[PDB]
Amino acid sequence: CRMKLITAIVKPFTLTDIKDALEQAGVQGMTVTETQGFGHTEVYRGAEYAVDFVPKVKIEVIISDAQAEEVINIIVETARTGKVGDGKVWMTNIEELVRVRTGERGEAAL
Amino acid sequence: MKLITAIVKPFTLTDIKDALEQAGVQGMTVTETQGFGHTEVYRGAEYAVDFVPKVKIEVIISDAQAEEVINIIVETARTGKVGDGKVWMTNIEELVRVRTGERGEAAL
Amino acid sequence: MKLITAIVKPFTLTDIKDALEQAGVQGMTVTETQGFGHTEVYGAEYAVDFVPKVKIEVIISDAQAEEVINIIVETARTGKVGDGKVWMTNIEELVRVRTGERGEAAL
CA distances from B19 to B24, B75, B78, B95 (A): 9, 10, 13, 24
Is position C27 annotated in a ligand binding site?
A: no
Is position B35 annotated in a ligand binding site?
A: no
| Residue pairs between chains B and C whose CB atoms are closer than 8 Å | 79
**CB contact (8 A) between residue C13 and residue A50:** yes
Q: Which residues of A touch C28 (CB under 8 A)?
A: 37-38
Please list, in sequence order, all residues whose beta carbon lies within 8 angstroms of the beta carbon of residue A86, skipping any fewer than 6 positions away.
Answer: A10, A11, A79, A80, C96, C97, C98
**CB contact (8 A) between residue B74 and residue A100:** yes
The residue type found at A16 is T
CA distances from A52 to A61, B31, B105, C52, C98 (A): 29, 22, 38, 20, 22
Q: Using alpha carbons, select from B61, B7, B29, A58 the residue that is nearest to residue C33.
A: B29
Q: Which helix (H) or strand (E) holds A16?
A: helix A15-24
A88 at interface of C, judged by CB pairs closer than 8 A: yes
Is position B1 annotated in a ligand binding site?
A: no
| Residue pairs between chains A and B whose CB atoms are closer than 8 Å | 79
Angle at A59 between CA A58 and CA A62, to 5 degrees: 140
- Looking at chain B from residue 12 to 41, which residues have their Cβ under 8 Å from any Cβ of chain A? 31-36, 39
> What is the rounded distance in angstroms from the CA atom of residue C55 to the CA atom of residue A13?
23
**What does the domain layout of chain C look like in residue ranges?**
1-107
- 3-class SS of residue B9: coil
C80 at interface of B, judged by CB pairs closer than 8 A: yes
Angle at A61 between CA A60 and CA A65, to 5 degrees: 130
Backbone φ/ψ region at C88: left (φ over 0), alpha (ψ -120 to 50), beta: beta
Cβ pair A100, B86 in contact under 8 A: yes
- Alpha helix ranges (H) inside B1-108: 13-22, 66-77
> What resolution (Å)?
2.2
Report the half-sphere exposure of A72 (CA within 13 A, side-chain side).
23
Q: Using alpha carbons, select from A41, A38, A39, A31 the residue that is nearest to residue A8.
A: A31
